[PDB]
């Protein structure tokens, strides 16, 4: 992200590659020129000009050393995104344990983290990361697991961005929805009052999908996944009492491809 | 024209101490 989003260590990487190459090549060239000087103890003017270029470049690169604290500051500025990604990868790896068919590989996460920007800067890139990982991983989870993952992404965002009272409100609303904690939630807009009225009126899925649509605003069906895809291999799964061939028939009819 | 070479040799003999310290 520091070589691609801000290009920070992009130009710092080309600069440090040039600096290390300068170190090695100029040490070798200084050894060769000192050997020539020992052999010599037109040519004099060239040697003096090369020496002057060498000391000017070395002086400039030594004065460039003071930018390294700025580089380290800019590197450690983007670390909250790292902790968030560690949380996201841990949640991917642990949803590989509730079921035997929801595994995760590191390469897929690397691919999606490149594709988030292949196509409040920290807040914007964090929002992009959450949105893209949800978009790319909603298609491998069924309705229950997809809804759970969406709720976890929304709660993680609203707890690592917003304050503590909203966090406590979300926790107690979840606890009331789980029929575990018998405590009236504290509201901070009309949406929370509407949710309280709905759970008073024994309506759940309406307000749950209301919160889900409040978090994410873009949907991704199987056609969208197969359209914006890189690999040529796709695996489809379902449950036994549900077929899925007719959807592929409709997709092939729409996309004008010979399905066999 | 030898002043630059003399200064380079002097600088090498100067930072020899830091070379020893950041060698050990």
UniProtKB/Swiss-Prot annotation, chain A:
Residues 1-68 form a coiled coil. It is found in: Cytoplasm, Cytoskeleton. The dynein complex consists of at least two heavy chains and a number of intermediate and light chains. Interacts with DYN3. Dynein heavy chains probably consist of an N-terminal stem (which binds cargo and interacts with other dynein components), and the head or motor domain. The motor contains six tandemly-linked AAA domains in the head, which form a ring. A stalk-like structure (formed by two of the coiled coil domains) protrudes between AAA 4 and AAA 5 and terminates in a microtubule-binding site. A seventh domain may also contribute to this ring; it is not clear whether the N-terminus or the C-terminus forms this extra domain. Cytoplasmic dynein acts as a motor for the intracellular retrograde motility of vesicles and organelles along microtubules. Dynein has ATPase activity; the force-producing power stroke is thought to occur on release of ADP. Required to maintain uniform nuclear distribution in hyphae. May play an important role in the proper orientation of the mitotic spindle into the budding daughter cell yeast. Probably required for normal progression of the cell cycle. Present with 195 molecules/cell in log phase SD medium. Belongs to the dynein heavy chain family. This is Dynein heavy chain, cytoplasmic. It comes from Saccharomyces cerevisiae (strain ATCC 204508 / S288c). The gene is DYN1. The chain holds residues 3533 to 3812 of 4092 of the full protein.
